[PDB]
Amino acid sequence: LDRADILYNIRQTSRPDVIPTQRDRPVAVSVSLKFINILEVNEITNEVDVVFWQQTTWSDRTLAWNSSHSPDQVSVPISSLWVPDLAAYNAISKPEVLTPQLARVVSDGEVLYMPSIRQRFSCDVSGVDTESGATCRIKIGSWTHHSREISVDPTTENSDDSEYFSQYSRFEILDVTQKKNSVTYSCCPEAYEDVEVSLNFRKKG
Amino acid sequence: LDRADILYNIRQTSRPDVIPTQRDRPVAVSVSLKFINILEVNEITNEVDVVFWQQTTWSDRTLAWNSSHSPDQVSVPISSLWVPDLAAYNAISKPEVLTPQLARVVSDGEVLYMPSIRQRFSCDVSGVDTESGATCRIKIGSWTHHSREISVDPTTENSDDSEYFSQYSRFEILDVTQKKNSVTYSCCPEAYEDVEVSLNFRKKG
Amino acid sequence: LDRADILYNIRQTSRPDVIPTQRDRPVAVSVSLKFINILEVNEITNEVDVVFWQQTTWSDRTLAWNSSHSPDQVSVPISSLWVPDLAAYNAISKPEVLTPQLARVVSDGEVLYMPSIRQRFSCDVSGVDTESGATCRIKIGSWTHHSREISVDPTTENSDDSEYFSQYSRFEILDVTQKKNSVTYSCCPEAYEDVEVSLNFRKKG
Amino acid sequence: LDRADILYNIRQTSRPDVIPTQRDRPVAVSVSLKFINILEVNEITNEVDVVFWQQTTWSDRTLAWNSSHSPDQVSVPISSLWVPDLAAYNAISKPEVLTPQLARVVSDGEVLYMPSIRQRFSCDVSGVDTESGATCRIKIGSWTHHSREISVDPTTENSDDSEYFSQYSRFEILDVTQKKNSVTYSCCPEAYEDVEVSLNFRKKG
Amino acid sequence: LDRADILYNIRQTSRPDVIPTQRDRPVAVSVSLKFINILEVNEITNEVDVVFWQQTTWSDRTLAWNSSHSPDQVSVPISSLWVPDLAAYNAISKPEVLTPQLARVVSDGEVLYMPSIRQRFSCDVSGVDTESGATCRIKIGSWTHHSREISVDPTTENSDDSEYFSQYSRFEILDVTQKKNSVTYSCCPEAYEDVEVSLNFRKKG
Ligand SMILES: C[N+](C)(C)CCOC(N)=O
Numbered sequence A, B, C, D, E: 001l002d003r004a005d006i007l008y009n010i011r012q013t014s015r016p017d018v019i020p021t022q023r024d025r026p027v028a029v030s031v032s033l034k035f036i037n038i039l040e041v042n043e044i045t046n047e048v049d050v051v052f053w054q055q056t057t058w059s060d061r062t063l064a065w066n067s068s069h070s071p072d073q074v075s076v077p078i079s080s081l082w083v084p085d086l087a088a089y090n091a092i093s094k095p096e097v098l099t100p101q102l103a104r105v106v107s108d109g110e111v112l113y114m115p116s117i118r119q120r121f122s123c124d125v126s127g128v129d130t131e132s133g134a135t136c137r138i139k140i141g142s143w144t145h146h147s148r149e150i151s152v153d154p155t156t157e158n159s160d161d162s163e164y165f166s167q168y169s170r171f172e173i174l175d176v177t178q179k180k181n182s183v184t185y186s187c188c189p190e191a192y193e194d195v196e197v198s199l200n201f202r203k204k205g
């Protein structure tokens, strides 16, 4: 099957509005932030302006194709795919997507989406000018799907936290840790899941 | 009836331009603001910049499905649903919607849309640096549907008004009260309902 | 008919690109600005930043329905209606529409569209800090339809000037007067009609 | 034909992607800027912020209709028409179109599109505070069509320079001249044409 | 064939979603930045604000037509073509496209798309006020297509750098060099090609 046929099939049958739930599994969404830049920081207002790649991964079996004499992967506009409705709860501006809105789809149905996002957050900026640094916590989860529908997990972070970080930022990254929680809010009786990203950073000497 | 079928049926037959009035009866729309952040304040200009979740709830029986062996709920893009034309009257900027534009639809036809919104308002900022604090009143109602078509239910869950307010804001919340008004404006003959949200807050100190 | 049928018929047959000229006569469009706020003023640059409701009224007989056993009125997305191409001539920013883009349509074909608009203007700000106040003149008319196609007249000097004006603005309204001009510019061969809105205001003391 | 029929026909058959070339002849596009305002000036950065009407005129014979017992002219959304791909070469912001995006089409096929545009430019601001004034040159031409396809031309100019200029601007207009260039650049060995608009202006006493 | 026919065929059959891969070989995309302006510079934050023409060239054989008695070239909206998903890696704002979104298509299938872009970057601004100048490096490559699907090379180095640059900028260009890189990052198993553009510039003085 060629690239054109795969993308035709996906465009014609994909249901961007349908969570690709399988029987009674939640859709396992993995989330991992790779920080590229820290552009503006305010210790007084506890506000931070930040650029990061939001590595998002999940499975959608309906996109799958037989890769016998066919490409293993294609790039697909996200408007033709179901995409998890992730939001950053402590964000104070809408995500400015810097990169083309294309996801990578593998023949088995895996979807890799990695937009570069600039976004401002309300978090702990105290101690940014210290050796210990500030620890800014960014919380990301599904806005409308609870835990029986979307689970979110971090990945494993044994590649350099500064691997893609800008050497020319005023700031440097001491540490990045990722944990998950199941929270129960007063609007709704079900538990919603999130990945908490801890950005320990500081102003350069 | 699986998720895909329900969302197909809703997309195909939902009449998003059509207020889901039942008989002579107004659509009962409940509104409740949960404040997340207070980002900028100006006592001189009486302007406030604020992030809140606008918890909006109503009934549309045309969305309903038999939930016998089916999901109790689905998430649906708001473009495929009728949504109340709520507006904040004392808003001085258009609502910046920070979250995915998806509503939660229950099998009996109840709809929860809970966007996170950043928006600026013109309101009483006097006494923001006092113990008593400022009391900033935000008025929300239907822009074109009068009281025989849309009623607003101003009920508040009695939890911390700071359940999800940012501990890192320069400001803190003393109190949040909600009341309902019914107002005859000179433009038109009929009364329009609103919810008045009183945000009593102050600078930390 | 019911609300759904009326809205279907309007959506299916309304011709948004078509001025609802009746016989050989101009469409009589009435325009009236109700000022809500004055947010920023600069006496040096003669610039003003202002929030107002643009009460716009006109007739479109093609939208009419028999209201015998039917609703007198419905709310309709403006994208499904012809709307006069009004522009504020001395505007220096595009109109930021703050409210839902719905117009109210009466069974006889009468339309009311009354968006809340934030917009900046170039006008006389001199004397803003005086007792006499500044007098800022805003001109509004059709951008492409001349007087044999669109007439604009003001509405009703009844409603108080400060009727909806924010008590929390730094400024107060002394007087609002509205007047129809008819003008033959040198570019074009026909008369264009406008409404001139004179906002006499000042800084509070 | 009535107005509705003419606009239906245009909408149904207009080919917005298709330059209305006749023969091997270029489409004669005339361009003329009428300055309304000069809002911000910086002599240090050589940047200017300006509001002007960009009067654009051209012929599209495919739009023509028999005007025997029919209107001479209609207003048409520019999305239903081919429009020349004009760009200001020395622009440093995208054109902010302030007015409704409607062109005027005459029964013989002439199309008059006069949007009001706010846009910033990089040009010579030196001597703005002098008697002689600054002379800011704005260059406008087709971005992708060369001279055998689009010929850009300056219109007639009995028209007064400050005919429509704001009396309330900090600045005044001494002179506005328009001339035509035909540059063959180093990449591409086909000629590209522009209209150069020279805005001689200064700060008021 | 005439212009209308060519554009119809392209619109009807172009597969904008489909990389025009020929055999298992990569689409050879050439990229070359021509700097028009440098608008704002910050040596403290290492941020730059820049206007450039992003000359992008590539082949799509599916767009080809027989040019025997037909035009050699047409202009085509990019929404009707596949376009490489290029992104500037060190950008900190989304590309503000200043120009009309049209690409030039040649009868053999060559495509030249050359938008003018304003964009901000994070790069080395140190020494901007020196004789040596600052050297700001901008990296551009495909965001989702690796090196077996997209190659990127600079266009050939006979052309010029200052030829299009604004004489009125506060800054001047000393040198522009373009080199190509192929780089495997730890996030992803495949190599991604980029073009690195080195902008050596300085403040006039
Ligand atoms: C509280 N929250 C944001 C996690 C879930 C809100 O529920 C919706 N939107 O249906």
Ligand SMILES: C[N+](C)(C)CCOC(N)=O
Pocket: B142, B143, B144, B185, B187, B188, B192, C103, C104, C112, C113, C114
């Ligand atoms: C006064 N107000 C805004 C509540 C209602 C305006 O009515 C409309 N838009 O038809």
